[PDB]
Design a binder for these strands. Sequence first.
RNA 1: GCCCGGAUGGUGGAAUCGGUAGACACAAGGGAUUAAUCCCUCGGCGCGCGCUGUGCGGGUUCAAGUCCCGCUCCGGGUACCA
Length: 860
Amino acid sequence: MQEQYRPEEIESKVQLHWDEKRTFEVTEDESKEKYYCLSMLPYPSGRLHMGHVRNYTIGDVIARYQRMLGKNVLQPIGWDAFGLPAEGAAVKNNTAPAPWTYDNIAYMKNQLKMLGFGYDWSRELATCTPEYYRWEQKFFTELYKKGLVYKKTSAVNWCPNDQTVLANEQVIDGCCWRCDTKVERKEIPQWFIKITAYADELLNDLDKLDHWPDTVKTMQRNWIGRSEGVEITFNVNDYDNTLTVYTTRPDTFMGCTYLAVAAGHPLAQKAAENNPELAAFIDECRNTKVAEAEMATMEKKGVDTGFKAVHPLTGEEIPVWAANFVLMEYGTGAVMAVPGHDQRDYEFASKYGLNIKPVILAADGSEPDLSQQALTEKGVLFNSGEFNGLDHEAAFNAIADKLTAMGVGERKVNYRLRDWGVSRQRYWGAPIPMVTLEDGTVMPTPDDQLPVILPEDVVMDGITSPIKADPEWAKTTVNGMPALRETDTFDTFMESSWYYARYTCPQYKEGMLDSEAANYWLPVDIYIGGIEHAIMHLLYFRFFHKLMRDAGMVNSDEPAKQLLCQGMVLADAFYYVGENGERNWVSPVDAIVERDEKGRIVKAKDAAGHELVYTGMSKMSKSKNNGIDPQVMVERYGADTVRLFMMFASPADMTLEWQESGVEGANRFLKRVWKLVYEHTAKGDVAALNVDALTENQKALRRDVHKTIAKVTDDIGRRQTFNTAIAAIMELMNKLAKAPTDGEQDRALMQEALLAVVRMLNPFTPHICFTLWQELKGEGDIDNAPWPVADEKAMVEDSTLVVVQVNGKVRAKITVPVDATEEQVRERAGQEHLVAKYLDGVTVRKVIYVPGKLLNLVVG
RNA sequence: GCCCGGAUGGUGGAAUCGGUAGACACAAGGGAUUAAUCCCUCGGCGCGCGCUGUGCGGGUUCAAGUCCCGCUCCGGGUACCA
Ligand SMILES: CC[C@@H](C)[C@H](N)C(=O)NS(=O)(=O)NC[C@H]1O[C@@H](n2cnc3c(N)ncnc32)[C@H](O)[C@@H]1O
Ligand SMILES: CC[C@H](C)[C@H](N)C(=O)NS(=O)(=O)NC[C@H]1O[C@@H](n2cnc3c(N)ncnc32)[C@H](O)[C@@H]1O
Ligand SMILES: [Mg+2]
Ligand SMILES: [Zn+2]
C-alpha cells in the first residue's frame, strides 16, 4: 500500500480478483437467503453514458450492500440488443446491425467491467441471439393458441417516398428524418396481444405493490384508465348501419347535440362520396400523427357529413360531424358530443356553431352559465325530459336502464389502455412466428420451426428490410403445403418483458424457464431503472410476468417486490440541419455556448461555426448525441470516484441535470479516506477496545461512528438516499481526522471507526475499500464482510438540542438533558439573552413544546 | 393537451411524519506553504446585531421549503426511441 491513493493501480487488480474468484457468480444456493437485485439491462448503443452509471451504481450499491447482509445475491447484466438505432447506424457505417451490435456490446461490456459492478457475468445474455428469442417466439405462439393474440389494422407512419415505415422519432415536425418528404398515415394489418384482457389484474394489483413508489402506481393507473359507462347505439337517416358511442356521462345524454365520427368511419366514407369538402377533410386527416401528444395539441378540425343520427331518447335529428381527433382503431371511432358539459365539445361547438345545450344544474341547483365554458362538474339533470331532477348517479343509471331496455344501450367497462401492437416492419428484431399458407390461412410457425432465425449477414439498403427484400426467406412448408412466414419483427419491448426470468437460467435449452431456478430467485426483490419506463416497460413487464404465471412458469402474481425508479440524468442537447432537412445532433462537449444571467444557454455554435438549435436538458441518449461517457473520468480518477460522485449528486429518485463540476470533492474525499487508513495502520496493531474506560470525547466519537452506521443503513436500505448516506459518512471522516491517535484507546476507537467506515463505503467504492479492508487487516474479502451493526448502547444521548422561538422565530438554541421537563426548558430558554430581549413588555399567551426538540413562546 | 414529477446560495444538494433553512460538497475569494496538502471567508441587504430569504400569487397554523387553493418554468411519459 502506497501513501498516494492511485486507483489506476488498485482498480483493475481488484476487478481481476473478482473475475477469477468468480465473486459475484451465484447459483440457486438453497442454504443462503436469496436477493435478486435487478437493474434494467441496457440497449447496446455504443458507449455508456452517465444515466447508465447512475442505474448500475445504484444497482451495484444495493447488491453489494445486500451481499454484505448475508444474502445470496443475483445481480445480472445483458444486452437488450434489438432495436431501431442499429439500423440507421449500420448504414452510416456500412455494416449489418448484428456486427455493429456485437461490437457495441464488447465495448460497453468493457465499460461496465472497469466500473467494477458486481455482476454474475456467467449469466450474461444478448437478446438478439436465437438462444434467447426462440423462447419469446414459442411463447407468442402459445399466447396465439390461447386467444390472446390477434390482427387488426393499425395506423403507421408511412413515408410516401421511401415507401417505408417510420417510428415516431423518425418523424420530425411531420416530415421524414432522411428527406423532408411528408409522412402519411397508413393503416396496416398488425399483430396485437390482448394486454386489455389483463387490465383489471394490472390495475387492481397495484394496491398490493406496497414497495412500488406512488408516482409509478398512479401513472400506471391513469394510463390503464378504466371507466364504467354505456355504449349507445344510434340509427342514422339514409344510412343502413348503426353508429355506436362510448360515454362515461350517459347522465348528460339529453345534452347531445352532435356526434363526431372518425375520418375513417364508413359514414364519413359514404358521405364523402357526394361532398367534395368532406372528401378533402378526410384526405387531409392522414396527416394526423400517430402520437397522442399531437392528436391533442393539434387544432380540432371537422366537416359536417350532412348525415343525421336520431337521438334515441329525444328523437331529434342530430348532425354527424367527421372530426380529426376521433379514431377508428381505438373504440367505435364515433363519439357523442355534449358541449354544455365537456370542454373539448365546448370548443368544437363554439368554433363551428353547433348547439351548446345545458342539461346539468350548477352545484347550487341553478342553470349553468355556459357563455364562456362547459359545466363539467356533475349534478342534477334539467331540460332532460323524463330524467329532470335526478342526481348524477340516479340519472346515469336511469338513462342507462332506458337505453338498455330500448336495446340500444349497454353498460360497458372501458380502458384507456389499448392492446399491445408488437408488429414492427423492420429488420433488426425477432421475427414474428406466424405463417400464412397457400390455403390463405394463418397459423403459428410450427413448433419444430422455432426459432425462426433472423439472418445476420445482410446487405442493408436502409429503406427495406433484408428479410422482406429477399423473396426466398419467407418460404417455408407447413402442414405439407407452401407457406410464407411473417417478415415483420417484434416490438423490442418483447425481449425486455421477460429477460428478468431468463437471467435465472440463461443456459437452459429445454425450455423458456427452468422454473426451479426461476422460482428460487423470483420475484425480483428490487428492480432499478429509469423513471422513463414507469409505464410502458413496467406494464409489459408485469403483464408478461402474469402470462408466464398463467402458463405455470412462475409462482407469484407480481414480478418485482420493490421498484426503484431513478431520476433521468439529463444534458443540454443541440442540433443543426443538414443541407437537406437532416437533424444533426451535436454533443454538448463540442458546443460553444453563450450563457444568460439566470445561467441559461442563449446562443450555441458547433466547431464549424454552425448555428445550433439548443433543445434544453433532456435525458442523456445517443439519439441527441448528448450522453457523457464516464470513460474519461474513469481513467483519470477511477471507478470509485465516478461512482461515489454519481451517488452523491442527489438522491436516486430525483432527475439530475449533469455537470462535470463536483467530481473532485468525491475524489478528494477518497484521498482523505485513504490517507487516514494509511496513517492509522502505519502505527501497527491496536489493543482491543475497552468500552467502559473511554473519555467522553471518545464516547461522543464512538456514538457518532455508531449513529452514522445506523443512518447510512437506514438511508441505503429504506430510503435510498445514497447522497445523504454518503454525506453522513463524510462528516464522520471529518470528525475522525480531528480525533487523537496516540492513546491505546484512541487507536482502538479509530480502528473500529475505520472498519465501520471502509465497509460503509464499500457498496459505493468497493475497489478502494477492498484494498482498505486488507490494510485494516479486515477479516477476509470485504465483499463478504458483514454489514456493520450499530450498537444501541453506544448511541444513547445524554442531552438533546432544543430550539427556541418567540412567535415562531428562532432566538436561541440550548443543549438540555434528554430528560428535561417543559418547565426546565422554559426556565432554561429564559436564561438566554435574546429570548429575554423578546419577552420584555409582553405576556406569554401560549407555549408550545415539542419534547426534546423545540419550544415556541407565542407572545403578545 | 393529458398523466407524473421537479424548482432551495455562484453550483449540486440537506432538512426522514408540519418544527433550526442551506448539513455535506463543488466553485470563488483570502491566507500558510514554492502544481499537491492545509487554513479562513462565503444566501441577501444594512455586524459580538436587525431584517429578509426555499420558482410565482394567495391561504391555513404557534410554526410552512414541507400542508391547502390558483399559476410559472423545467424534465419524464404520452403507446413505433429505448
Ligand atoms: C360529457 C360527455 C363528453 C365529455 C364527451 N362527449 C364524452 O363522451 N366523454 S367521455 O369520457 O364519455 N368519452 C369517453 C372517451 O371518448 C373520447 N372522447 C369523447 N369526446 C371527445 C372529444 N370531444 N375529443 C376527443 N376525445 C373524445 C375520450 O378520449 C374518452 O377517451
Ligand atoms: C429494460 C430496459 C429498457 C427496455 C432498455 N434496455 C433501456 O432502457 N436501455 S438503456 O440503455 O437505454 N438504459 C438501460 C437503463 O439505463 C437507464 N437510463 C437510460 N438513459 C438514462 C438517462 N439519461 N438518465 C437516467 N437513466 C437512464 C434506463 O432507464 C434503463 O434503466
Ligand atoms: Mg438553485
Ligand atoms: Zn423518406
